[PDB]
């Protein structure tokens, strides 16, 4: 009976929302707001505690990119701030390996980071690891076989279809089979030993195509596409199904939440977010 948490996002301005959805009863919870509003953040969980990493506060008054790590305990319904990252990271990618949070890529103004840094909850310290081969913002991240994959994004010049693996024990990056489609701002997650990359922006249009990396074969195969095209969308997995959340379809801000069943290979509309938004963080606990 774990919930799908969603933090922040954008609609006219950067948002402070923290909300949880329960697929068993189809209900939404209104939880404690973020201390500082933000969009283009990422979510993750370590030891039952939700973390919200980076992003930016694009308000009416102006724009400030975030280096902040804040931590939310479900049991106490309270946000607590943690040690900040070495640099700010808007459109950040995040993954978890052995209770350590990896901050991947993202931007600060005109700087498009290829750096990566690693958070240790028990010490509350950030340390730089080996940087990625390509600079990436709008980057999907997915932990699989204890390796961290950085998929797609924007390099400062072009939208990317390239992906690359990180090796924590060796501390080094390696390119892998590039994607069928170009995808910046895609939702990237891990279901049944495969990486799925859903949605995103190819350089011209928004996307509903979903493609699946098999590790053994090293090839990306298309699966059934989404009903609603989207970019800068939220994504997670909950009990053997992929959930995509909100986003921007070129015209409007989505509150649609679609759900992928891998057995039937069919997407379906399950619920609506309480208000349409893009650039949310998402995690499950």
């Amino acid at each position: 009976g774990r919930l799908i948490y969603t933090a922040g996002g954008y609609f006219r301005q950067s948002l402070s929302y923290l909300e949880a959805y329960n697929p068993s009863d189809g209900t939404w919870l209104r939880l404690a707001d973020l201390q500082v509003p933000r969009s283009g953040l990422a979510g993750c969980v370590v030891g039952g505690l939700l973390y919200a990493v980076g992003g930016r506060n694009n308000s009416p008054d102006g724009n400030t990119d975030s280096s902040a790590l804040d931590c939310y305990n479900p049991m106490t319904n309270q946000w607590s701030p943690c040690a900040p990252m070495s640099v700010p990271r808007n459109r950040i990618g995040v993954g978890v390996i052995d209770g350590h949070i990896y901050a991947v890529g993202g931007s600060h103004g005109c700087i498009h980071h290829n750096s990566v840094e690693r958070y240790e909850p028990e010490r509350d310290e950030w340390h730089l690891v080996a940087p990625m081969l390509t600079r990436r913002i709008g980057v999907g991240v997915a932990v699989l076989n204890r390796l961290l994959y950085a998929v797609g994004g924007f390099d400062g010049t072009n939208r990317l279809n390239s992906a690359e693996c990180y090796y924590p024990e060796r501390n080094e990056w390696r390119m892998i089979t590039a994607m069928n489609t170009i995808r910046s701002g895609a939702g990237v997650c891990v279901l049944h030993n495969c990486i799925y990359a859903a949605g995103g922006y190819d350089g011209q249009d928004q996307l509903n195509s979903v493609e699946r990396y098999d590790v053994a074969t090293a090839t990306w195969t298309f699966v059934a596409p989404m009903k609603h095209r989207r970019s800068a969308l939220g994504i997670t997995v909950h009990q053997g199904r992929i959930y995509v959340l909100g986003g921007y379809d070129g015209h409007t801000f989505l509150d649609s939440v679609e759900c992928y069943d891998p057995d039937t290979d069919t997407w379906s509309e399950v619920t609506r977010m309480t208000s349409g938004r893009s650039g949310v963080g998402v995690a499950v606990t």
């Binding site: 969009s39 283009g40 694009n58 709008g138 800068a232 921007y248 650039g279």
Partner: peptide, 9 residues
């Protein structure tokens, strides 16, 4: 107007 996020910078 960012085409990917829809944010107005």
């Amino acid at each position: 107007l960012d085409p990917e996020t829809g944010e107005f910078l």
